[PDB]
Amino acid sequence: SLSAAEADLAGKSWAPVFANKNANGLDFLVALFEKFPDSANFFADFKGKSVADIKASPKLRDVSSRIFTRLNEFVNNAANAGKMSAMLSQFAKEHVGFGVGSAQFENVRSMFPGFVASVAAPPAGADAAWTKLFGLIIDALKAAGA
Numbered sequence: 001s002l003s004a005a006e007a008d009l010a011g012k013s014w015a016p017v018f019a020n021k022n023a024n025g026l027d028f029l030v031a032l033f034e035k036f037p038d039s040a041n042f043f044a045d046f047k048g049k050s051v052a053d054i055k056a057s058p059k060l061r062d063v064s065s066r067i068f069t070r071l072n073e074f075v076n077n078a079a080n081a082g083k084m085s086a087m088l089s090q091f092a093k094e095h096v097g098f099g100v101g102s103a104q105f106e107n108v109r110s111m112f113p114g115f116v117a118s119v120a121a122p123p124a125g126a127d128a129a130w131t132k133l134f135g136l137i138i139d140a141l142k143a144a145g146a
């Protein structure tokens, strides 16, 4: 897990992002796809389609919303190793079955801090908290077998 201090920093940088969950969640998904084109191919609904096609999709909102809803829960429980345990297991389990592995999460991690900063400057120490959080997710995926 993260420490309470770290978790707070993550929550603090997340708030402005989560404040506009619909628009920001769609944006994160679009940015991912733009920076890491292979990612879309894991999605049944988006495989083959271009970013414009994805933006125009009536399915986009369903996807991006479930993602932000779960990220919000990770931010919320981050400092509790116990909840993280279960959360990480279950998340990894789920993703692996779809063929997603740690490398895709290494990509999310790379682009995350820059995405948050495009919404509002994060507090000092927040970027490191996110990379640690994503670090925990990456580890989970590896244990999950990918």
Ligand code: HEM
Binding pocket: 039, 040, 042, 043, 044, 045, 066, 067, 068, 070, 071, 094, 095, 098, 100, 104, 105, 108
């Ligand atoms: C940024 C962190 C992300 C979060 C919080 C997140 C969250 C989730 C959630 C909550 C589910 C639905 C689980 C279910 O209903 O059983 C899901 C499904 C899935 N996610 Fe993620 N995800 C993350 C990033 C990714 C990445 C990077 C990819 C691929 C590169 C991905 C690929 C998938 C796929 C392929 C599904 C199956 C759902 C479908 O398309 O029908 N996720 N994800």
